[PDB]
Design a protein around this ligand. Structure first.
Ligand SMILES: Nc1nc2c(ncn2[C@@H]2O[C@H](COP(=O)(O)OP(=O)(O)OP(=O)(O)O)[C@@H](O)[C@H]2O)c(=O)[nH]1
Ligand SMILES: Nc1nc2c(ncn2[C@@H]2O[C@H](COP(=O)(O)OP(=O)(O)OP(=O)(O)O)[C@@H](O)[C@H]2O)c(=O)[nH]1
Ligand SMILES: Nc1nc2c(ncn2[C@@H]2O[C@H](COP(=O)(O)OP(=O)(O)O)[C@@H](O)[C@H]2O)c(=O)[nH]1
Ligand SMILES: [Mg+2]
Lengths: 58, 431, 437, 39, 187, 51, 45, 57, 437
């Protein structure tokens, strides 16, 4: 639901990129950490839940 | 291919429209089962105007039936030519207005106008051209007047450009037929002025004398009364359904009569009228047909155009005849009775001619008049309204049904203003 | 190559087109299916049909006509019955809702949905021609489509074409006879477009043709059919010089150059006047001088106006049949020596004579006699000012009290066009009264 | 309801009405599966 | 644009360090986001064009159409980060003739399929911070047989973290690059 | 919604009115234009010519 | 060109009306529209 | 004035093909409409065409 | 001598080929069972039906057609219909499980188990023919077998045969009318995998044929039978030069060398004229200029795309009937002297014409008329780029959140194939605008 809720600021510095309050960013490395420290049958389940995601280990 | 939708409201509207569908099914060859058994193809040639086509040969009417009680529609369904109507077009309630305009317009007709509007919207989107609407009701009843005027208001809100016709069975000067007729008529005319495109004020007493003197007939019966009314409607509408040398539809009729927007109250007239046993002495000519039109005793309202002044006259000759006889008779009747004609409208008669006379008739002729004499009807209604409203007769019903007295005062003011403009255009001169 | 396209607008135009294309089909020997009758091939290279009819395939002729209405019937009546296969299905164009005797409906609301379609049909029929003589528009002033939509068509035709000649035949309201009440309003509103989108304006009064039918043809209750047959006879006599070969004869440009003195004065009067029944034709000297005098009589005009109250500017006399030029010159001499007929001082030679070899043909079930000599006089005079004055008095009488204006204003035209058209007709009246003296 | 034939239906009614049905709807007697129909 | 300027050593077009380093580029975003953030690998400002359906989110090198980035330098070097996602870029060049070809290199193609106006070539870049070097002269000699004249436009589509895009004449290996053009990775 | 300027199928697939005056359903157009040609059957043609 | 004196408001003075002509058969029309009319001959009073 | 030989009008097409081509119908996105409105004209719409249609100012 | 092989893939292709072979049998005088009539003789003389048929000894003609669909029914109505005896049983190839509106299921599944069988049948037909001219592959871009197995078969044919013309009839999905929800995905993928294997990709659109049938051909209720009859007329006009003698003989090789400027633009729109109905038919002249103008009208285009938003690249005008090449030259000059019709600045010679002497044959029970002249357009233009723009908008809306992609991934396709196809068709749009500028 909240995967694509990132900041479309254009060419503008995100000065709040130290408190880490961007859900659209945070979900991405949550999924990357899941796929990395998951297993062989992890991309199929993650792709089954969220259809946009694609593998970081391929 | 120009379709019009027919609505009937109240007892009078239901019986009159039932007779109307009976006669216009007879002239189109539609049997009571709903199929077609006509002689020539001209009967079904323009059948799309009044009938929708079902699967097979079924031709259902383009009609909506409204009454707050099953009642009169129950009688119509259990009468002849009652099986042609779709059962989904019978919209009815449970209570029934007790000749109460407030009940028919605010309390009982309020929670039925949604169903009637859905039926009307469906049956009108089933059309292809949708020339307009015609409604049969009386200005002397509860659901005839209040629910009918509510329907007119909502339909003008929905479709603001279509032609609206009302057939407006007005209260009679003699007898009563209802004791709250001044209230009902004053409240309904106030809606009819600002929401109807053309209105044929029809009087029971005038129809009584027409049916009993010019037709003898002894016992007249509402079958023949409503059939005279239905014959006038057929003569009005016929240029949609049959070809002619000079055709004229509802919009031509309304443009060529109505001079100013709040002057669309007419007097109808059907003028082949032969008493029993005088057809042998009848000559059956165009001058005699026009003379039977332009006779004051042949009007279907109590008002006297000889007392008043004609503004616009529409004559539709439905049958085969000559432009010679027709045009010269209109010119002669105008030039002889130039006293009963406004001088500021030169040759204030529209002429239409069809080609198909009634079955069993050689020629027919419908008469519509827009004289200033019709102010007498509103004067009668307004004076009876004053006599009741001064002593607050029967007003506790209208006030207890959630409706105030300033509605009555505004309705009376509008009717008196209508009489004022009618008298102004009567006595206004050319130069 | 002398084709001219006929447009028939309104109920009056459509009925006149029926009575006119009947006459054309019998004059060219064509059955009401496009084809010639059985074993009645044309032969002899007769190219007379190649002005009103077009070869499509294997001896079929389509008319060069566009029948327009805004409503069904009449056009539907001729689409279904007798002359069913004669016309192309896409040239009898009809609408759904009529213009309701309203110039505003005919010009602004219902007019702008079918005008492009009939213009495209006109363009296709013009492309089918190898050089077009002009257009013949037929309408009544009357109400609705005959005024508003005819105004729209003339307004677009004058900017599309304009090297061609547009002759329009208008059924003018009578002095007292009328089948409507807004005829003065519609006729006033269409005066401007008939002033500035037409080249010749042949105009007819229903009451005058009624009187001619009652007096000459001896029929006592005429319908529209006899009047439309007389209009068809007039138009046939006008275009018979283009159709058939003969003696010295005029064209649609020879006529205009010899008729109209000024661009604003283009409102002549048409009188086809060997009009009689056969029973009285047994007892008449049907001679050239007699029929010329019958044309010049004030009681044989198709507009209820007295030409003795005006001065003749020019007259184009179209003769048909066994007609030599010398008795035509004798008739012109007698007309000149007549003192009742007066001519304007700046037009001394006021006659243009065109003689054609083909006599007119009677339709079966008609009322005209089969005469061997026919004459149509097309005369520009100042007597049409009486019709203008009658129209203006009726319009002023209605417009003083602001009657029926709400229909036009609600349907879309602004208030000022009424006064603008009244001023236009006042200017035309001033022009005619100035040029008369 | 009963089994539809529609050939008897538009044969038992008026010729003008049946002509109108065939003109406006060519599927009232759509008989592609008629030679393969085996009465 | 970029004509009548000295183009000898290097020509930088995009550089995420700056006030407005997208002034000449044209921002088209439909289902993604462009933003400047501080990367955790080089500890410096980096532009990001991350977005699904990479054919929509993209930036052209000219701000508008009907204008050409006239650059005569053959080599194109881009400092890009691997996000393990669909990366795509395109360059339009003018041949010896008046024809303009397009070289479109993407990380999800599998066959180099030469077509009259487009090359459609694949690429397989490593993990982390890659430096894409793209010759254009050998490439226009090998794909069509013509010679490189000038560039027209540069499109970098999506799913990338850009540090610097520039042009150079020769290869310009690591130890003769200037300090600001080096890709420096602190510990 | 049927098109504006075209004949309709119901109008086209019909019989004409009677041209006999002694018939009741006789129009003025039928009795005036076609009283000579009451049992008229129109004859359809075809184009001729080939390459 | 342009000038200071072009800034003078010159207005438009006045445009005439040029009233209608009212043709000479007006009296004949007024006579002939009433030479035949009577008062209440067919309907009666 | 239009019949006068010093008045040539660059519009007013000589061909039916040009007559339909100068219309407003957009074949990519106008849904299932008919011959009456597949050839609608800008003069009928009331656009800013440089054609004098009436003498009225 | 010259021979063509027709492959009808999918339900749309099979029904199209049914109409096409019915028309071919009617115009070559072959009865539906396969024999020629005994008492009647229609074939022979002006016929080269050996280009589309095979003579198996005793007198039966077997068409060179392969009807393929991966679902039994639509092949069994051919197998049990009126034309059951016409086709050899191994020509009508059917599968077991449907492609289920899935490019992945038509490309990487069940069709992979029948591509060998259809290739063997194609090999047998090519061994039978005495010199193959090309293939006519009829299918739809909508989805399933038409977009899937058809593309796979074209790729296999390009690998196996090579250097032969593969003309492809593509039923392109309408801009708004659609009978499926994965049509953008299927059309994107089949365009990507057909763009390098189709020499020509003649585009036909159902909504535009609906428009044609409603406006020109009367019919208030158009259907797939009428659509297939019109497409059969188009392909008969295309292939009539292989079967009848003509002044300008145009075979299947010319369509790729005169309509494909660059090896990416091979999508010419089809247009047929006259498409007049039998009611009007013989009420018009139907001349060469008339049919060419009606062919050039933007309303009479059989792909929902007006040519006024683009410049014409090339135009193939296949004239048929009593057409004279001087008349064709005059018509082509008349269009070339029009400025609203725009051609690209690099192509002064924008027309290739083919004159054929045999007029088209009317189908009994059909809706067209028996006409002499008929022009068929194959117009390559810079106008269908807006259709590609709309279709990439549809693909973008679908693929922004990966709707329906799980089916394509689960039956074989990789995830990146969709993006490859979108990238290549965006490059095709860039190619169109680069050529147009
Ligand atoms: N001579 C002649 N005049 C006719 C005929 N039909 C109608 N008219 C004239 O036309 C007038 C009636 O108005 P129409 O012309 O019918 O109106 P329209 O042009 O059909 O347009 P609408 O208002 O929509 O009916 C009458 O006053 C007649 O003078 C005809 O058949 N013959
Ligand atoms: N012109 C025409 N088009 C058709 C016909 N039948 C189907 N189509 C088109 O085909 C498209 C969809 O493809 P289908 O034919 O239904 O299915 P398919 O191509 O056989 O592929 P499968 O799904 O495997 O059956 C639709 O959008 C239609 O427009 C037809 O008879 N005539
Ligand atoms: N002509 C005629 N008038 C009727 C008929 N039925 C009722 N009326 C009139 O209608 C008036 C009464 O209105 P009513 O029908 O009771 O209205 P409702 O109460 O709203 O249904 C009376 O004046 C009657 O004259 C009828 O069948 N024919
Ligand atoms: Mg009319």
């Amino acid at each position: 639901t909240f995967k694509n809720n990132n900041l479309n600021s254009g060419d503008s510095i995100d000065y709040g990129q130290q408190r880490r309050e961007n859900i659209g960013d945070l979900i991405h490395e949550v999924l990357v950490a899941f796929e990395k420290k998951g297993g062989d049958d992890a991309f199929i389940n993650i792709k089954y839940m969220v259809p946009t995601h694609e593998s970081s280990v391929l | 291919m120009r379709e019009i939708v027919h609505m009937q409201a109240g007892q009078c509207g239901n019986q009159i429209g039932a007779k109307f569908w009976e006669v216009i099914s007879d002239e189109h060859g539609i049997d009571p089962t709903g199929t077609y058994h006509g002689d020539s193809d001209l009967q079904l040639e323009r059948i799309n105007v009044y009938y929708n086509e079902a699967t097979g040969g079924k031709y259902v009417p383009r009609a909506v039936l409204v009454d707050l009680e099953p009642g009169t529609m129950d009688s119509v369904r259990s009468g002849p030519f009652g099986q042609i109507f779709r059962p989904d077009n019978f919209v009815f309630g449970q209570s029934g207005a007790g000749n109460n305009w407030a009940k028919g317009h605010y309390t009982e007709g309020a929670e039925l106008v949604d169903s009637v509007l859905d039926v009307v919207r469906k049956e009108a989107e089933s059309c292809d051209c949708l020339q307009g609407f015609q409604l049969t009701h009386s200005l002397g009843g509860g659901t005839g007047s209040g629910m009918g005027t509510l329907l007119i208001s909502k339909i003008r809100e929905e479709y603001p450009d279509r032609i609206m016709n009302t057939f407006s069975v007005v209260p009679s000067p003699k007898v009563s037929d209802t004791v709250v007729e001044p209230y009902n008529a004053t409240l309904s005319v106030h809606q009819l002025v600002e929401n109807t495109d053309e209105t044929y004020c029809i009087d029971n007493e005038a129809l009584y004398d027409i049916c009993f003197r010019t037709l003898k007939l002894t016992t007249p019966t509402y079958g023949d009364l409503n059939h005279l009314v239905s014959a006038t409607m057929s003569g009005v509408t016929t240029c949609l359904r049959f070809p002619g040398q000079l055709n004229a539809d509802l919009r031509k009729l309304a443009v060529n009569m109505v001079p100013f927007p709040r002057l669309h109250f007419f007097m109808p007239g059907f003028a082949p009228l032969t008493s029993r046993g005088s057809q042998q002495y009848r000559a059956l000519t165009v001058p005699e047909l026009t003379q039977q039109m332009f006779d004051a005793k042949n009007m279907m309202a109590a008002c006297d155009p000889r007392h008043g002044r004609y503004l616009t006259v529409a004559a539709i000759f439905r049958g085969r005849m000559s432009m010679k006889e027709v045009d010269e008779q209109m010119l002669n009747v105008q030039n002889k009775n130039s006293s009963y004609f406004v001088e500021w409208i030169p040759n204030n008669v529209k002429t239409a001619v069809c080609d198909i006379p009634p079955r069993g008739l050689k020629m027919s002729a419908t008469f519509i008049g827009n004289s200033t004499a019709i102010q007498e009807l509103f004067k009668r209604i307004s004076e009876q309204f004053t006599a009741m409203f001064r002593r607050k007769a029967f007003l506790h019903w209208y006030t207890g049904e959630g409706m105030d007295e300033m509605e009555f005062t505004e309705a009376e003011s509008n009717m008196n203003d209508l009489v004022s403009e009618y008298q102004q255009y009567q006595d206004a001169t050319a130069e | 190559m002398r084709e001219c396209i006929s447009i028939h607008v309104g109920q009056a135009g459509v009925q006149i087109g029926n009575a006119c294309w009947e006459l054309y089909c019998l004059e060219h020997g064509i059955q009401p299916d496009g084809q010639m009758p059985s074993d009645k091939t044309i032969g002899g290279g007769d190219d007379s049909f190649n002005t009103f009819f077009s070869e499509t395939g294997a001896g079929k002729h389509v008319p060069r006509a566009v029948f327009v209405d805004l409503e069904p019937t009449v056009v539907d009546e001729v689409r279904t019955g007798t002359y069913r296969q004669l016309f192309h299905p896409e040239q009898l164009i009809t609408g759904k809702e009529d213009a309701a005797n309203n110039y505003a409906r005919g010009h602004y609301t219902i007019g702008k949905e079918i005008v492009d379609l009939v213009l495209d049909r006109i363009r296709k029929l013009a492309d089918q021609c190898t050089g077009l003589q002009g257009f013949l528009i037929f309408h009544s002033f009357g109400g609705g489509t005959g005024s508003g939509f005819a105004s729209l068509l003339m307004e677009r035709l004058s900017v599309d074409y304009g090297k061609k000649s547009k002759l329009e035949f208008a059924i003018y309201p009578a002095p007292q006879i009328s089948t409507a009440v807004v005829e003065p309003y519609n006729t006033i509103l269409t005066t401007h477009t008939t002033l500035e989108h037409s080249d010749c304006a042949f105009m007819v009064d229903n009451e005058a043709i009624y009187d001619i039918c009652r007096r000459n043809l001896d029929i006592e209750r005429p319908t529209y059919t006899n009047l439309n047959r007389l209009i068809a006879q007039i138009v046939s006599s006008i275009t018979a010089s283009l159709r058939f070969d003969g003696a010295l004869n005029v064209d649609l440009t020879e006529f205009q150059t010899n008729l109209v003195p000024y661009p604003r004065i283009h409102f002549p009067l048409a009188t086809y006047a060997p009009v009689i029944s056969a029973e009285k034709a047994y007892h008449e000297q049907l001679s050239v001088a007699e029929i010329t005098n019958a044309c010049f009589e004030p009681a044989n005009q198709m507009v209820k106006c007295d030409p003795r109250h005006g001065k003749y500017m020019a007259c184009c006399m179209l003769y048909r049949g066994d007609v030599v030029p010398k008795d035509v010159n004798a008739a012109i001499a007698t007309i000149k020596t007549k003192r009742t007929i007066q001519f304007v001082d700046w037009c001394p030679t006021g006659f243009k004579v065109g003689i054609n070899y083909q006599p007119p043909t009677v339709v079966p079930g008609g009322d005209l006699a089969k005469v061997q000599r026919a004459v149509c006089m097309l005369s520009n005079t100042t007597a049409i000012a009486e019709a203008w004055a009658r129209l203006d008095h009726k319009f002023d009488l209605m417009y003083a009290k602001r009657a029926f204006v709400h229909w036009y204003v609600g349907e879309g035209m602004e208030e000022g066009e009424f006064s603008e058209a009244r001023e236009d007709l006042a200017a035309l009246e001033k022009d005619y009264e100035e040029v008369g003296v | 309801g009963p089994t539809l034939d529609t050939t008897h239906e538009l044969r038992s009614l008026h010729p003008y009405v049946a002509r109108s049905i065939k003109a406006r709807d060519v599927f009232f007697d759509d008989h592609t599966h008629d030679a393969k129909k085996h009465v | 644009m970029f004509k009548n300027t000295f183009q000898s050593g290097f020509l930088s077009i995009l550089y995420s360090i700056g006030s407005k380093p997208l002034q000449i580029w044209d921002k088209k975003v439909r289902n993604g986001h462009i933003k400047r953030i501080t990367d955790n690998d080089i500890q410096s400002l980096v532009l990001e064009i991350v977005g699904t359906n990479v054919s929509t989110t993209l930036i052209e090198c000219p701000a508008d159409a009907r204008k050409t980035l006239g650059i005569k330098l053959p080599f194109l070097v881009m400092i890009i980060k691997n996000l393990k996602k669909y990366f795509t870029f395109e360059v339009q060049v003018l041949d010896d003739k008046n024809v303009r070809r397009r070289f479109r290199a993407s990380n999800y193609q599998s066959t180099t399929r030469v077509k009259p106006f487009i090359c459609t070539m694949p690429m397989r870049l490593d993990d982390g911070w890659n430096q894409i070097q793209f010759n254009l002269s050998d490439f226009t000699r090998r794909a069509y047989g013509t010679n490189y004249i000038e560039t027209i436009r540069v499109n970098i589509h999506a799913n990338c973290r850009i540090r610097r895009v520039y042009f150079s004449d020769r290869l310009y290996s690591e130890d003769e690059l200037p300090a600001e053009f080096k890709l420096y990775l602190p510990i | 919604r049927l098109p504006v300027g075209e004949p309709t199928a119901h109008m086209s697939a019909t019989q004409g009115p009677d041209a006999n005056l002694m018939k009741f359903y006789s129009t003025s157009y039928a009795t005036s234009f076609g009283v000579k040609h009451e049992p008229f059957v129109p004859r359809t043609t075809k184009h001729v010519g080939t390459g | 060109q342009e000038s200071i004196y072009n800034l003078i408001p010159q207005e438009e003075v006045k445009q005439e009306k040029q009233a209608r002509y009212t043709s000479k058969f007006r009296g004949n029309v007024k006579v002939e529209e009433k030479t035949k009319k009577t008062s209440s001959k067919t309907m009666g009073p | 004035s239009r019949r006068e030989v010093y008045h040539h009008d660059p519009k007013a097409p000589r061909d039916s093909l040009d007559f339909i081509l100068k219309a407003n119908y957009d074949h990519h996105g106008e849904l299932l409409k008919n011959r009456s409105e597949t050839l609608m004209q800008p003069e009928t719409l009331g656009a800013n065409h440089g054609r004098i249609l009436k003498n009225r100012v």
